[PDB]
Amino acid sequence: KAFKAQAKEAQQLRERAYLDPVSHLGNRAYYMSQLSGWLSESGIGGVAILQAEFIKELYEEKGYEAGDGMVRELADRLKNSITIKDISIARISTYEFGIIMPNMDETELKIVAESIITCVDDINANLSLGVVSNKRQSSTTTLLSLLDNALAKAKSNPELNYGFISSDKIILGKQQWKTLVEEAIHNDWFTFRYQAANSSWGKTFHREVFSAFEKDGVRYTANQFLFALEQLNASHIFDQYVIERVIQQLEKGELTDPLAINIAQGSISQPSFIRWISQTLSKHLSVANLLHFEIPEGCFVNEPHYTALFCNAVRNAGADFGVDNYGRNFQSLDYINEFRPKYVKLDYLFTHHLDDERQKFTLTSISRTAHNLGITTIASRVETQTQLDFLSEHFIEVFQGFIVDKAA
Ligand SMILES: [Mg+2]
C-alpha cells in the first residue's frame, strides 16, 4: 500500500483500538496502558476519576441517545477545557472518566478538580470526583486503590466538591527546580547515561542520552525537572547544556555510535535555540554525523514551522533527527512524509499491553507507515526477550530497554 493508504489505515486502526467511539476520548485499554507507563516511569502527578452520575441516569431513564449525546458533550468540554501537557482523558465506563495529569502538584490538581466540576456545571446526583496526588512510582493496583478511596471520601462527605488523596514528602516548586538545574549546569554536576537502541543482532542504531545530577546525596533525573523548565520557558538552557556536553564526549574520539538527544518542545519553539543549534553544529561539524536529535511528535503536529526550521538546520550540518513518541497525539501521520525522519520511536502506548486483537494491527500498521518509507522503526522500554521477538514480528527493527541493558 502507498503511504496515504497506509497512514489512513494506521489512523483508522489506532482510533478503533484506543479511542472510545462516542466520546472520542481514550478507551478503557488506553487508560489502562497510559496508567501503567506513567506509574512505572515516573508516577509524579495526579490522577482523577470522574463519576458522571447524571450521565448514568440519562442512560437508565432516557436511553442511549441521551446518554451518548451527553457523553460526547462532556468529553468535548473536558477535552477543550483541560489543556495540560501530556494529559490523558479516557472514558473508562459508560458514565465514568479517568484523567492522568503528570508532573502536577497538589495545588494545581485541586485547581483542575474545580475545572472538571465547572465542565459538568456548564452541561447540567450529578457527579462524584476522586483526585489522587501521586509522588513516587507505585503499582497500578496501589494507585487504583487510592483512587477508589478518593471516590469513597467524596461520597462519605458531600460537603466538598471532590475527594482528595495524597501519597505520601514536601515537593519542589517550579522556580526551585530552575535554580537547582542552573546550579547543576553551573558546576557540571550532570551525569549522563547512554541507553543503546539495537537491532535484533545487537547492532547499535544509536544511544539515547539520559541526564541526572546529585545534591546532598539525592539524585534528580531529567524527567523530574524537564516540565518545570518548559513551564518556565527555560527548557532551552538545559537542552543546550546537554548538546554541548554530548559534543565533548563525542570529541574525545571514543564513541563510534550516534547519540540520541531528546529536544524539548519548548526548546524548538524558541527561535534563539534554532539559531544556537546551527552555530554550534557548524563549529563542531566533525561529530555532527553521530548526532541524533529526538523530536517529540507534538512539535511536528503543533509546531511544524519551527520543527521544519530545526530539522532543516540539523540536516544541513550532517546531523539527523527522529520522532519520539510517534503516533501518540492521535493526529494525522502526514508529517512523516513531509519531514522524512531518520527514525520513529513508537510511543509506549502502541508497544506495551497489547492484550487485544486490534492493538497488534495498530502496531503493524503504524510501523509499516514509517517502514515502507525507509524510516527506521524503534520500540523503547522493551524489557523482555519475548517482548522483543513479538515486536519484531510487527515491523519493529530497533529495540531499546531492559532487554538490551542486561546482555554483557
Ligand atoms: Mg526519547
Residue numbers in the entry: 221 to 344, 353 to 396, 399 to 638
Paper text:
LapG-containing operons also harbor a gene that encodes a conserved c-di-GMP receptor, LapD. LapD is composed of a periplasmic Cache domain, flanked by single-transmembrane helices, followed in the cytoplasm by a juxtamembrane HAMP domain with a signaling (or S) helix that leads into a GGDEF and EAL domain module. However, in LapD, both domains are enzymatically inactive, yet the EAL domain retains its ability to bind c-di-GMP. Through detailed structure-function studies, a mechanism for the regulation of LapG via LapD has emerged: LapD adopts an autoinhibited conformation that is characterized by the GGDEF domain functioning as a lid atop the EAL domain, which occludes the c-di-GMP binding site.
To gain unbiased insight into the structure and regulation of V. cholerae LapD, we determined a crystal structure of its cytoplasmic domains comprising the S helix followed by GGDEF and EAL domains in the absence of c-di-GMP. Crystals diffracted X rays to a maximum resolution of 2.7 Å. The electron density maps resolved the S helix with the final refined model spanning residues 221 to 638 (top). Despite the low sequence identity, the structures of V. cholerae and P. fluorescens LapD superimpose with an overall root mean square deviation (RMSD) of 1.7 Å, indicating structural conservation of their apo states. The major difference pertains to a rigid body rotation of the GGDEF domain of approximately 12° relative to the EAL domain. However, the autoinhibitory S helix-EAL domain interaction responsible for P. fluorescens LapD autoinhibition at low cellular c-di-GMP levels is well preserved in the structure of the V. cholerae ortholog. More specifically, residues F223, A227, and R234 of the S helix (corresponding to F222, A226, and R233 of P. fluorescens LapD) nestle against a partially hydrophobic interface on the EAL domain. As seen with P. fluorescens LapD, this contact places the GGDEF domain atop the putative c-di-GMP binding site on the EAL domain. Based on structural work, we show that the Vibrio cholerae LapD ortholog adopts a similar autoinhibited conformation utilizing the same intramolecular interfaces as determined for the related P. fluorescens LapD, despite low sequence conservation.
